[model samples]
Target: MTQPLVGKQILIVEDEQVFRSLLDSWFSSLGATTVLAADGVDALELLGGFTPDLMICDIAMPRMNGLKLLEHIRNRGDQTPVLVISATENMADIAKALRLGVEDVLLKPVKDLNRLREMVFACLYPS
Candidate 1:
């Protein structure tokens, strides 16, 4: 059987160790290649060699935040699809992210991993 994310490359920028592990495992299970980063700085470093089909990011982190990373991506004219997975419920933050061209935003502690998988599939294979 073919997986939805087979052959896809995904970059996940999350500071929480446990959550990063969870996302790594989930993307692995779907047959997608995942690049993990602890924060925006690491993510930028990884971008030097790899260009993922999608980027999943958190809003908060040390050194550099997801918003800054998003800005960097846009400024570089790299149009890779981005999904913001933040715990923040602040409308202002969400609005700013939307304006920055994030494909979607999902709140953290997401109980439905399946929903996340579906959202990822939708972003990567939009129809």
Candidate 2:
């Protein structure tokens, strides 16, 4: 049987190799094709040629960061849903992200893969 997200595409933007790899595995296991980017710059490069159904990003990264990525997307009139997973606990950072219109902000070390899967599903298939 096909999985819930079998035909969906997801972009994961993260700086940490381990976390990025783990998210890759998780999304792949759920049958969603995933594109990985090291940071906001790399994500933008990928976005130039391909558009995913959803994007998961981290706030702190080299080259560029999640906030900048979201800003660019909004400014360009792209409506792809963004879900942020970052360790930044500051209220200003969280508020800025919300203002940018991210679907949700998940603080990292997200220990439950199932919850993540559910959130992804909800974002992609919201009803």
Each model's lDDT comes to 0.87, 0.87
TM-score for each of the candidates: 0.93, 0.93
Which ten-residue region of model 2 has the weakest summed lDDT? 58-67
Candidate 2: what lDDT?
Answer: 0.87
The backbone clash count of each candidate, in order, is: 0, 0
* lDDT of residue 56 for candidate 1: 91
Off by over 4 Å in 2: none
Clashing pairs in 1: none
Q: In candidate 2, list every pair of residues with a backbone clash.
A: none
For residues 15-111, what per-residue lDDT tens digits would candidate 2 score against the true structure?
Answer: 8899889999888988999999876887887787878999999777778777888898889888889999988978898899899999999879987
